[PDB]
Amino acid sequence: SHRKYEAPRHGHLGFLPRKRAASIRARVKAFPKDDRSKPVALTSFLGYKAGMTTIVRDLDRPGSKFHKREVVEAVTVVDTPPVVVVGVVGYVETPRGLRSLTTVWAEHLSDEVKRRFYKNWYKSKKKAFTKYSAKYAQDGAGIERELARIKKYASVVRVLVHTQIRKTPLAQKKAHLAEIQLNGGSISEKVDWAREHFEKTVAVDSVFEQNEMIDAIAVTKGHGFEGVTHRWGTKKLPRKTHRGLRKVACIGAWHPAHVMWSVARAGQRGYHSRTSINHKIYRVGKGDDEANGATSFDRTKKTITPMGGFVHYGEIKNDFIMVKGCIPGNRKRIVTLRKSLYTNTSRKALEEVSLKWIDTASKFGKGRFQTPAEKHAFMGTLKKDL
Amino acid sequence: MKVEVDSFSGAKIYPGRGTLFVRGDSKIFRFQNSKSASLFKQRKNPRRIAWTVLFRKHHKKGI
Amino acid sequence: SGNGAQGTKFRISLGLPVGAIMNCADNSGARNLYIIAVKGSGSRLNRLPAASLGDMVMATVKKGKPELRKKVMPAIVVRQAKSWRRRDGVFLYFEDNAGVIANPKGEMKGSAITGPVGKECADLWPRVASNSGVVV
RNA sequence: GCAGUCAAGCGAGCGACAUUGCUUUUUGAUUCUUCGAUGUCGGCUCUUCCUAUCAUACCGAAGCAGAAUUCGGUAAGCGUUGGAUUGUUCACCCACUAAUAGGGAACGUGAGCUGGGUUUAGACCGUCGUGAGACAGGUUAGUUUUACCCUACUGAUGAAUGUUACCGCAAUAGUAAUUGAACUUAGUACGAGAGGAACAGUUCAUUCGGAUAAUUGGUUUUUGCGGCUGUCUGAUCAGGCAUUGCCGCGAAGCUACCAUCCGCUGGAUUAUGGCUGAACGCCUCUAAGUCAGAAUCCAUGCUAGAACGCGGUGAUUUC
RNA sequence: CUCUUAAGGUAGCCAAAUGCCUCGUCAUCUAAUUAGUGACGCGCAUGAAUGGAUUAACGAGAUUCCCACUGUCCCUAUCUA
RNA sequence: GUGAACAGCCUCUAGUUGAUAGAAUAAUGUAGAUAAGGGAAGUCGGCAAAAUAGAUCCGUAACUUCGGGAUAAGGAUUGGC
């Protein structure tokens, strides 16, 4: 018979299977559409998540009750040192998909990028691109003939960039490597730009601007095998239930006589690949700038790092991108930022943001002070002072 | 923006921290953390708690 | 919400589900109000309707003057004990739940409110802000 | 239970006397399978399907205007509740809402729960019998067992492809957003007046979903700090035991519409409305052709990545 | 008035553990009550040691409401062995 | 020893240190807990858990077989020197 009282189902069928992701990097499925008119430029970037903080600003939203009023919002900072370009790959369009045609690497690759090709580095002979580097020789005929084919045949050109992990405080020494698509210019200009930038760095300020809207891709925080009640939000059974009450009661009918994929079942929760969208940038800071956390209305020389360092990360000493709210991922993880795939003309998209105060009270507890000089003024001399 | 003062302790409540309370007689009390908010709800006198501004002022500490 | 609403209300935490007794804050002769519904609620398979500060609820008078008892009559929530966040970052709460009687289009049955009144109820009801003494 | 045809009658629309059908959510008829046993009513919890459409969407019409109401068509994408009495199925009331539609899946669902009903043995009462005892009459108390096997579903590894390592393509499968209100248009169009809209634009909210933990709140074996009782170490100091002795606060972690953030835009078509135009010298959206078109469909986008689909690239062993 | 028996239910009591029709009708308790209580009684089929009506105290008996209290529930989360 | 107490808790004489162990800390369990706002809206049903609790002083209704109801109900105090 029919169910007595209706209700929506639990969970979303578009996010199946709920399994561990293949790689710790979430891969950028789609890149923005190209138009050949503009200059050459990257479409995505790589960074490392740091933590969160608080921001106070005015609201420029005509019509709303809080127009020209203060509002407190949350933000998340991403440690983004410059990326290093180390190769170019060309893709031809075939009736059964795209297809790479050639990869042309640079000559000298850093140690931290060629750690990505070894599992047991400490006992290796460090033989990696050793024969390839002898290709530049005295003339470089081999390399320049390979680039000739990319200009002749490829329809999509991409670039290989490895992040400079050594600068971030992570204990990891191996550097990530990922492909970023070049948009803008003829196919000829695209491959030339890559060649000039071999071994050169590309900073964050050359990709994103302050009020842009971007998309985040990253692998979510994992939790392991999880029951039905916290994997799909199913109702709990009454107290007087024999053989457990955090279980789904009916897992199907007599017929079809097979458990359906649509039923809620226990298993992996967390560690999926997600692509959130429409995050507004709030600041594009500079690493070698003191007063990274100051503003027009604050005016105190202090950096973005709270007191005691971001919990479980450390201190920020490079460029950074703080965005409105949450991005998928946990702290310390690789996060890849993408340019939006459509022109957003909403009021929210076009709104311009000028901050008024960035928080730096310790996140390791109920912080009370913003600067070590503020603590000394309020409290005065202590015994441990000279 | 404005920085407030905790009623029980006298600390500074930067935006988005603590809680606010409005009892029947319209009086407003601001607290910086749950530690102070609890010590208020236990009808406990600030001038006895050692780490507060009222206690230090009363005992003439920090001259 | 109601005919007398002056506009929109930003969400605040629900804290007075069906079955909650909340003081009467006016001089209409009632001592307390008893929520039996909330205007502007939705549906879910076991979700109880809950009212917040500014909502017009349908309510009965449990202890109060005889004429006002034994009949369903609207009300407006003027205080609540559940703590809610304003867009300016401040969590706050009153020390009691209260409300006042009203007709369908937001006119008070009485002529005086005793105690503080939330600014979100006053901004939404022109005929509650008139009789309010102190607004927080 | 549902639906047609006739057209006397009533008044765009209803419909008698007759009469042709459909469904298997009613109850009968029959006794084909099961009596060396297929666990029986209802409720709870959960997935999916049908359409005989309550709501939303798109069209048509009524009545000499609005507004509201009513009727008819395409339509299963999405939704369809909180409760008082009752074991209920059904039913009736109060209340909100866009609305509170009808059904199937061994009258779905008892090695998933519960045991209020029925349906053993104890007990009472009314009527019935001389009696033992009878009664789809009322009342009260009454043991709810087993998974480690195969498959199915949810997750997790994995030999073999020279070896090993990094970066990718994308067949196939899945998919998602939903509904209301207020400001402006505007006291305008319309109408004698009373009254009273709509497209473009803006601010919020209901229902669902995916994450995240700056802040707020929950939790405490941080047994971190303090406090208190009894007793034991001769006293103080510092400690033992009281199944974590009790009390206040309590960072980290986990977590809550109890907190916060995010939830895309293009094409093709259905009903319908047109262009040109015959059949049928006129006529006609149609027969050839062709323009616009929606909660519809397909792409964009989002999840997996065939462990027997594929490509690029690095290094390939001096006793 | 009349048929009829051995005699034709008296004092009491009731939709009660005894009433089919039945969710009887009226009032009270609720926003709403097939529930509870107080009333009415041609009572299918109440009633006198088949004991009738009432009754303070008592009851791991059956039923209804109120105050207090609470994770039963809204709506779940966390800790220990 | 504490206390009204061969209650519960700690100890002296005497007696045992016996019950397969090592390692991590998933889901579901058994046993023990705590929860903001509401307070029975859950359920056939307050089933389960919670709240009350010792002692001293004050105050204690209807009904009653005059013995009871009664710890009714409702309040206040409690350490150390």
Coordinates of N, CA and C (backbone and C1' of nucleotides) in Angstrom, one line a residue, chain D residues 174-255:
Chain D
rG174 P 21.0 6.2 -15.4 O5' 21.3 7.2 -14.1 C5' 21.3 6.6 -12.8 C4' 21.9 7.6 -11.8 C3' 21.3 9.0 -11.7 O3' 20.0 9.0 -11.1 C1' 23.6 9.1 -11.6
rU175 P 18.9 9.9 -11.6 O5' 19.4 11.4 -11.3 C5' 19.7 11.8 -10.0 C4' 20.2 13.2 -9.9 C3' 19.4 14.2 -10.8 O3' 18.2 14.6 -10.2 C1' 21.7 14.6 -11.1
rA176 P 17.2 15.6 -11.0 O5' 17.8 17.0 -10.7 C5' 17.2 18.2 -11.2 C4' 17.5 19.4 -10.3 C3' 19.0 19.7 -10.2 O3' 19.1 21.1 -10.0 C1' 18.1 19.2 -8.1
rA177 P 19.1 22.1 -11.2 O5' 17.8 23.0 -11.0 C5' 17.6 23.7 -9.7 C4' 16.7 23.0 -8.8 C3' 15.4 23.6 -8.4 O3' 14.4 23.5 -9.4 C1' 16.4 22.8 -6.5
rU178 P 13.1 24.4 -9.4 O5' 12.4 24.2 -8.0 C5' 11.6 23.1 -7.8 C4' 10.8 23.3 -6.5 C3' 9.9 24.4 -6.3 O3' 8.6 24.1 -6.9 C1' 11.3 24.3 -4.4
rU179 P 7.8 25.2 -7.7 O5' 7.2 26.2 -6.5 C5' 5.9 25.9 -5.9 C4' 5.8 26.6 -4.6 C3' 5.5 28.1 -4.6 O3' 4.2 28.4 -4.9 C1' 7.1 27.6 -3.0
rG180 P 3.8 29.9 -5.2 O5' 4.0 30.6 -3.7 C5' 2.9 30.6 -2.8 C4' 3.3 31.4 -1.6 C3' 3.3 32.9 -1.7 O3' 2.0 33.4 -1.6 C1' 5.2 32.2 -0.6
rA181 P 1.7 34.9 -2.2 O5' 2.5 35.9 -1.2 C5' 2.1 36.0 0.1 C4' 3.1 36.8 1.0 C3' 3.3 38.2 0.6 O3' 2.2 39.1 1.1 C1' 5.4 37.2 0.9
rA182 P 1.8 40.4 0.3 O5' 3.0 41.4 0.5 C5' 3.1 42.2 1.7 C4' 4.5 42.7 1.9 C3' 4.8 44.0 1.1 O3' 4.4 45.2 1.6 C1' 6.6 42.4 1.0
rC183 P 4.0 46.4 0.7 O5' 5.4 46.9 0.1 C5' 6.2 47.9 0.7 C4' 7.4 48.3 -0.1 C3' 7.1 49.0 -1.4 O3' 6.8 50.4 -1.3 C1' 8.8 47.4 -1.7
rU184 P 5.8 51.0 -2.4 O5' 6.6 50.9 -3.8 C5' 7.7 51.8 -4.1 C4' 8.2 51.5 -5.5 C3' 7.2 51.7 -6.6 O3' 7.0 53.0 -7.0 C1' 8.4 49.6 -6.9
rU185 P 5.5 53.5 -7.5 O5' 5.2 52.7 -8.8 C5' 6.0 53.0 -10.0 C4' 5.8 52.0 -11.1 C3' 4.4 51.7 -11.5 O3' 4.0 52.7 -12.5 C1' 5.4 49.7 -11.1
rA186 P 2.5 53.3 -12.4 O5' 2.2 53.5 -10.8 C5' 1.4 54.6 -10.4 C4' 0.6 54.2 -9.1 C3' 1.5 54.1 -7.9 O3' 0.8 54.5 -6.7 C1' 0.4 52.1 -8.3
rG187 P 0.5 56.0 -6.3 O5' -0.7 55.9 -5.3 C5' -2.0 56.3 -5.6 C4' -2.8 55.4 -6.4 C3' -4.1 55.9 -6.9 O3' -4.4 55.4 -8.2 C1' -4.4 53.9 -5.7
rU188 P -5.5 56.1 -9.1 O5' -4.9 55.9 -10.6 C5' -3.7 56.6 -11.0 C4' -2.9 55.7 -11.9 C3' -3.7 54.9 -12.9 O3' -4.2 55.6 -14.0 C1' -2.0 53.6 -11.9
rA189 P -5.7 55.5 -14.4 O5' -5.8 54.2 -15.3 C5' -5.0 54.2 -16.6 C4' -4.9 52.7 -17.0 C3' -6.2 52.0 -17.3 O3' -6.7 52.3 -18.6 C1' -4.7 50.6 -16.1
rC190 P -8.2 52.9 -18.8 O5' -9.1 51.9 -18.0 C5' -9.3 50.5 -18.5 C4' -10.1 49.7 -17.6 C3' -11.4 50.3 -17.2 O3' -12.4 50.2 -18.2 C1' -10.4 49.4 -15.3
rG191 P -13.5 51.4 -18.4 O5' -14.3 51.4 -17.0 C5' -15.5 50.6 -16.9 C4' -15.9 50.5 -15.4 C3' -16.6 51.7 -14.8 O3' -17.9 51.8 -15.1 C1' -14.9 50.9 -13.3
rA192 P -18.6 53.2 -15.5 O5' -18.2 54.1 -14.2 C5' -18.3 55.5 -14.3 C4' -19.0 56.1 -13.1 C3' -18.3 55.7 -11.8 O3' -17.2 56.6 -11.4 C1' -20.6 55.3 -11.6
rG193 P -15.9 56.0 -10.8 O5' -16.2 55.7 -9.3 C5' -16.7 56.7 -8.4 C4' -17.5 56.1 -7.3 C3' -16.7 55.1 -6.5 O3' -15.9 55.7 -5.4 C1' -18.8 54.2 -7.0
rA194 P -14.6 55.0 -4.8 O5' -15.2 53.8 -4.1 C5' -16.0 53.9 -2.9 C4' -16.8 52.6 -2.6 C3' -15.9 51.4 -2.3 O3' -15.5 51.4 -0.9 C1' -17.4 50.8 -3.9
rG195 P -14.0 51.2 -0.5 O5' -13.8 49.6 -0.8 C5' -12.6 49.1 -1.4 C4' -13.0 48.4 -2.7 C3' -11.8 47.7 -3.4 O3' -11.5 46.5 -2.9 C1' -13.1 48.9 -5.0
rG196 P -10.0 46.0 -2.8 O5' -9.5 46.1 -4.3 C5' -9.7 45.0 -5.2 C4' -9.0 45.3 -6.5 C3' -7.5 45.6 -6.4 O3' -6.8 44.4 -6.4 C1' -8.6 47.2 -7.8
rA197 P -5.3 44.5 -5.8 O5' -4.5 45.2 -7.0 C5' -3.4 44.6 -7.7 C4' -3.9 43.8 -8.9 C3' -2.8 43.3 -9.8 O3' -2.2 42.0 -9.3 C1' -4.4 44.3 -11.1
rA198 P -0.6 41.9 -9.2 O5' -0.2 41.7 -10.7 C5' -0.7 40.7 -11.5 C4' -0.4 40.9 -13.0 C3' 1.1 41.1 -13.3 O3' 1.8 39.9 -13.4 C1' -0.2 42.8 -14.4
rC199 P 3.3 39.7 -13.0 O5' 4.1 40.4 -14.3 C5' 4.2 39.6 -15.5 C4' 5.0 40.3 -16.5 C3' 6.4 40.8 -16.1 O3' 7.4 39.7 -16.2 C1' 5.4 42.6 -17.2
rA200 P 8.7 39.7 -15.2 O5' 9.4 41.1 -15.6 C5' 10.2 41.2 -16.7 C4' 10.9 42.5 -16.8 C3' 11.8 42.8 -15.6 O3' 13.1 42.1 -15.7 C1' 10.5 44.7 -16.1
rG201 P 13.6 41.4 -14.4 O5' 14.0 42.6 -13.3 C5' 14.9 43.6 -13.7 C4' 14.9 44.7 -12.7 C3' 15.2 44.4 -11.3 O3' 16.5 44.1 -11.1 C1' 13.3 45.8 -11.3
rU202 P 17.0 43.0 -10.0 O5' 16.5 43.6 -8.6 C5' 17.2 44.7 -8.0 C4' 16.6 45.1 -6.7 C3' 16.7 44.2 -5.5 O3' 18.0 44.2 -4.9 C1' 14.5 45.1 -5.6
rU203 P 18.4 43.0 -4.0 O5' 17.4 43.1 -2.8 C5' 17.6 44.1 -1.7 C4' 16.7 43.8 -0.6 C3' 16.8 42.5 0.1 O3' 17.8 42.5 1.1 C1' 14.5 42.9 -0.3
rC204 P 18.3 41.1 1.8 O5' 17.0 40.7 2.6 C5' 16.8 39.3 2.9 C4' 15.4 39.0 3.4 C3' 15.1 37.6 3.7 O3' 15.6 37.2 5.0 C1' 13.4 38.5 2.4
rA205 P 16.2 35.7 5.2 O5' 14.9 34.8 5.1 C5' 14.0 34.8 6.2 C4' 12.6 34.3 5.7 C3' 12.5 32.8 5.5 O3' 12.4 32.1 6.6 C1' 11.5 34.0 3.7
rU206 P 12.8 30.5 6.7 O5' 11.7 29.7 5.9 C5' 10.4 29.5 6.5 C4' 9.5 28.7 5.7 C3' 10.0 27.3 5.4 O3' 9.8 26.3 6.4 C1' 9.2 28.3 3.4
rU207 P 10.9 25.3 6.8 O5' 11.0 24.3 5.6 C5' 9.8 23.5 5.3 C4' 10.1 22.7 4.0 C3' 11.4 22.0 3.8 O3' 11.5 20.8 4.6 C1' 10.9 23.1 1.9
rC208 P 13.0 20.3 5.0 O5' 13.7 20.1 3.6 C5' 13.5 18.8 2.9 C4' 14.3 18.8 1.6 C3' 15.8 18.7 1.8 O3' 16.3 17.4 2.1 C1' 15.3 20.3 0.2
rG209 P 17.7 17.3 3.0 O5' 18.8 17.6 2.0 C5' 18.8 17.0 0.7 C4' 19.8 17.6 -0.2 C3' 21.2 17.7 0.3 O3' 21.9 16.5 0.1 C1' 20.6 19.8 -0.7
rG210 P 23.1 16.1 1.1 O5' 24.2 17.1 0.7 C5' 24.8 16.9 -0.6 C4' 26.0 17.9 -0.8 C3' 26.9 18.0 0.4 O3' 27.8 16.9 0.5 C1' 26.4 20.1 -0.3
rA211 P 28.7 16.7 1.8 O5' 29.8 17.8 1.6 C5' 30.6 18.3 2.6 C4' 31.0 19.7 2.4 C3' 31.8 20.4 3.6 O3' 33.2 20.1 3.4 C1' 30.0 21.7 2.9
rU212 P 34.1 19.8 4.7 O5' 34.0 21.2 5.5 C5' 34.6 22.4 5.0 C4' 34.3 23.6 5.8 C3' 34.6 23.5 7.3 O3' 36.0 23.8 7.5 C1' 32.5 24.4 7.0
rA213 P 36.7 23.5 8.9 O5' 35.8 24.4 9.9 C5' 36.0 25.8 10.0 C4' 35.5 26.3 11.3 C3' 36.1 25.7 12.6 O3' 36.4 26.7 13.5 C1' 33.7 25.6 12.7
rA214 P 37.8 27.6 13.4 O5' 37.3 29.1 13.4 C5' 38.2 30.1 13.7 C4' 37.6 31.5 13.6 C3' 36.6 31.8 14.6 O3' 37.1 32.2 15.9 C1' 35.8 32.5 12.5
rU215 P 36.6 31.6 17.3 O5' 35.2 32.4 17.4 C5' 35.1 33.8 17.4 C4' 33.7 34.3 17.3 C3' 32.7 33.6 18.3 O3' 32.7 34.3 19.6 C1' 31.8 33.5 16.2
rU216 P 32.5 33.4 20.9 O5' 31.0 32.9 20.9 C5' 30.0 33.9 21.0 C4' 28.6 33.2 20.9 C3' 28.3 32.0 21.7 O3' 28.1 32.3 23.1 C1' 27.5 31.7 19.5
rG217 P 28.6 31.2 24.2 O5' 27.7 29.9 24.0 C5' 26.3 30.0 24.4 C4' 25.6 28.7 23.9 C3' 26.1 27.4 24.4 O3' 25.7 27.1 25.7 C1' 25.7 27.3 22.0
rG218 P 26.4 26.0 26.5 O5' 26.2 24.6 25.7 C5' 24.9 24.0 25.7 C4' 25.0 22.6 25.2 C3' 26.0 21.7 25.8 O3' 25.6 21.1 27.0 C1' 26.2 21.5 23.5
rU219 P 26.6 20.9 28.2 O5' 27.4 19.6 27.8 C5' 26.8 18.5 27.3 C4' 27.7 17.6 26.6 C3' 29.0 17.3 27.4 O3' 28.9 16.4 28.4 C1' 29.5 17.8 25.1
rU220 P 29.9 16.3 29.6 O5' 31.3 16.2 28.9 C5' 31.8 14.9 28.7 C4' 33.3 14.8 29.1 C3' 33.5 15.1 30.5 O3' 34.6 14.3 31.0 C1' 34.5 16.8 29.3
rU221 P 34.4 13.3 32.2 O5' 35.8 12.4 32.3 C5' 36.9 12.9 33.0 C4' 38.1 13.0 32.1 C3' 37.8 13.2 30.7 O3' 38.7 14.2 30.1 C1' 39.2 11.3 31.0
rU222 P 38.1 15.6 29.8 O5' 39.4 16.5 29.3 C5' 40.0 16.2 28.1 C4' 41.5 16.0 28.3 C3' 41.9 15.6 29.7 O3' 42.9 14.6 29.6 C1' 42.9 17.6 29.1
rU223 P 42.6 13.1 29.7 O5' 42.1 12.9 31.2 C5' 43.0 13.3 32.3 C4' 42.2 14.2 33.2 C3' 43.0 14.7 34.4 O3' 43.7 15.9 34.1 C1' 40.9 13.9 35.1
rG224 P 45.3 16.0 34.3 O5' 45.5 17.6 34.3 C5' 45.8 18.2 33.1 C4' 45.6 19.7 33.2 C3' 45.3 20.3 34.5 O3' 46.5 20.5 35.3 C1' 43.8 21.2 33.0
rC225 P 46.4 20.6 36.9 O5' 45.5 21.8 37.2 C5' 46.1 23.1 37.0 C4' 45.1 24.2 37.5 C3' 44.6 24.0 38.9 O3' 45.5 24.3 40.0 C1' 42.8 24.7 37.5
rG226 P 45.2 23.6 41.4 O5' 43.8 24.2 41.9 C5' 43.8 25.5 42.4 C4' 42.4 26.1 42.6 C3' 41.6 25.5 43.8 O3' 42.0 26.0 45.0 C1' 40.3 25.6 41.9
rG227 P 41.8 25.1 46.4 O5' 40.2 24.9 46.5 C5' 39.4 26.0 46.7 C4' 38.0 25.7 46.8 C3' 37.6 24.6 47.8 O3' 37.4 25.1 49.1 C1' 36.5 24.2 45.7
rC228 P 37.5 24.1 50.3 O5' 36.3 23.1 50.1 C5' 35.0 23.5 50.6 C4' 34.1 22.3 50.6 C3' 34.5 21.1 51.4 O3' 34.3 21.2 52.8 C1' 33.8 20.4 49.2
rU229 P 35.0 20.2 53.7 O5' 34.2 18.8 53.6 C5' 32.9 18.7 54.0 C4' 32.3 17.3 53.8 C3' 33.1 16.2 54.5 O3' 32.9 16.2 55.9 C1' 32.5 15.6 52.3
rG230 P 34.0 15.7 56.9 O5' 34.1 14.1 56.7 C5' 32.9 13.3 56.9 C4' 33.1 11.9 56.4 C3' 34.4 11.3 56.8 O3' 34.4 10.8 58.2 C1' 33.9 10.8 54.6
rU231 P 35.7 10.9 59.1 O5' 36.6 9.8 58.5 C5' 36.2 8.4 58.6 C4' 37.0 7.5 57.7 C3' 38.5 7.4 57.9 O3' 38.8 6.4 58.8 C1' 38.0 7.9 55.6
rC232 P 40.1 6.5 59.7 O5' 41.3 6.3 58.6 C5' 41.8 5.0 58.4 C4' 42.9 5.0 57.3 C3' 44.2 5.7 57.7 O3' 45.0 5.0 58.6 C1' 43.6 6.3 55.5
rU233 P 46.1 5.9 59.4 O5' 47.2 6.3 58.4 C5' 48.0 5.4 57.7 C4' 49.0 6.0 56.8 C3' 49.9 7.1 57.5 O3' 50.8 6.6 58.3 C1' 49.3 7.8 55.3
rG234 P 51.8 7.5 59.2 O5' 50.7 8.5 59.9 C5' 49.9 8.1 61.0 C4' 49.8 9.1 62.1 C3' 49.8 10.6 61.6 O3' 48.5 11.0 61.1 C1' 51.3 10.4 63.4
rA235 P 48.5 12.1 59.9 O5' 48.8 13.4 60.6 C5' 47.9 14.1 61.6 C4' 48.4 15.4 61.9 C3' 48.6 16.4 60.7 O3' 47.4 17.0 60.3 C1' 50.5 16.5 62.1
rU236 P 47.2 17.4 58.7 O5' 48.4 18.5 58.5 C5' 48.2 19.8 58.9 C4' 49.3 20.7 58.5 C3' 49.6 20.7 57.0 O3' 48.8 21.6 56.3 C1' 51.6 20.4 58.1
rC237 P 48.4 21.3 54.7 O5' 49.9 21.0 54.1 C5' 50.6 22.1 53.5 C4' 51.8 21.5 52.8 C3' 51.6 20.7 51.5 O3' 51.4 21.5 50.4 C1' 53.2 19.6 52.9
rA238 P 50.1 21.2 49.4 O5' 50.5 19.8 48.7 C5' 51.7 19.6 48.0 C4' 52.0 18.2 47.8 C3' 50.9 17.3 47.2 O3' 50.8 17.4 45.8 C1' 51.7 16.3 49.1
rG239 P 49.6 16.8 45.0 O5' 49.7 15.3 45.4 C5' 48.5 14.5 45.5 C4' 48.8 13.2 46.2 C3' 47.7 12.1 46.1 O3' 47.6 11.4 44.9 C1' 48.6 12.3 48.3
rG240 P 46.2 10.9 44.4 O5' 45.9 9.6 45.4 C5' 46.8 8.5 45.4 C4' 46.3 7.4 46.3 C3' 44.9 6.9 46.1 O3' 44.7 6.0 45.0 C1' 45.4 7.1 48.4
rC241 P 43.4 6.1 44.1 O5' 42.2 5.5 45.1 C5' 42.2 4.1 45.4 C4' 41.1 3.8 46.3 C3' 39.7 4.3 45.9 O3' 39.1 3.3 45.0 C1' 40.0 5.0 48.1
rA242 P 38.2 3.8 43.8 O5' 36.9 4.4 44.5 C5' 36.1 3.5 45.3 C4' 34.9 4.3 46.0 C3' 34.1 5.1 45.1 O3' 33.1 4.4 44.4 C1' 34.6 6.3 47.1
rU243 P 32.5 4.8 43.0 O5' 33.3 3.9 42.0 C5' 34.1 4.5 41.0 C4' 34.2 3.6 39.8 C3' 33.0 3.6 38.8 O3' 33.4 3.4 37.5 C1' 33.3 1.5 39.6
rU244 P 34.5 4.3 36.7 O5' 34.8 5.5 37.6 C5' 36.1 6.0 37.8 C4' 36.2 7.5 37.8 C3' 35.2 8.2 38.7 O3' 35.8 9.3 39.3 C1' 35.0 8.9 36.5
rG245 P 36.3 9.3 40.8 O5' 35.0 9.7 41.6 C5' 34.0 8.8 41.9 C4' 33.0 9.3 43.0 C3' 32.4 10.7 42.7 O3' 31.2 10.6 41.8 C1' 33.3 10.7 44.8
rC246 P 31.0 11.6 40.7 O5' 30.5 12.9 41.4 C5' 29.2 13.0 41.9 C4' 29.0 14.2 42.8 C3' 29.1 15.6 42.2 O3' 27.9 16.0 41.6 C1' 30.5 15.5 44.0
rC247 P 27.9 16.9 40.3 O5' 28.5 18.3 40.8 C5' 27.7 19.2 41.6 C4' 28.4 20.4 41.9 C3' 28.9 21.3 40.8 O3' 27.8 22.0 40.2 C1' 30.5 21.2 42.4
rG248 P 28.0 22.4 38.6 O5' 29.1 23.6 38.6 C5' 28.8 24.9 39.1 C4' 29.9 25.8 38.9 C3' 30.5 25.9 37.5 O3' 29.7 26.6 36.6 C1' 32.2 25.8 39.0
rC249 P 29.7 26.3 35.0 O5' 31.2 26.8 34.6 C5' 31.5 28.1 34.6 C4' 33.0 28.3 34.4 C3' 33.6 27.8 33.1 O3' 33.4 28.7 32.0 C1' 35.0 27.2 34.9
rG250 P 33.5 28.1 30.6 O5' 34.7 27.2 30.6 C5' 36.0 27.7 30.5 C4' 37.1 26.6 30.5 C3' 37.1 25.7 29.3 O3' 37.8 26.3 28.2 C1' 37.2 24.4 31.2
rA251 P 37.0 26.9 26.9 O5' 38.2 27.5 26.0 C5' 38.6 26.9 24.8 C4' 40.0 26.7 24.7 C3' 40.5 25.7 23.6 O3' 40.6 26.4 22.4 C1' 41.4 25.0 25.7
rA252 P 39.7 25.9 21.2 O5' 40.4 24.6 20.6 C5' 41.8 24.5 20.6 C4' 42.2 23.1 20.3 C3' 41.3 22.3 19.4 O3' 41.5 22.5 18.0 C1' 41.8 21.0 21.3
rG253 P 40.4 22.2 17.0 O5' 39.9 20.7 17.3 C5' 40.5 19.6 16.7 C4' 39.8 18.4 17.0 C3' 38.4 18.2 16.5 O3' 38.4 17.8 15.1 C1' 38.3 17.7 18.8
rC254 P 37.2 18.3 14.1 O5' 35.9 17.7 14.7 C5' 35.6 16.3 14.5 C4' 34.4 15.9 15.3 C3' 33.1 16.5 15.0 O3' 32.5 15.9 13.9 C1' 33.4 16.6 17.3
rU255 P 31.8 16.7 12.8 O5' 30.5 17.4 13.5 C5' 29.5 16.6 14.0 C4' 28.6 17.3 15.0 C3' 27.7 18.4 14.5 O3' 26.5 17.9 14.0 C1' 28.9 19.1 16.5

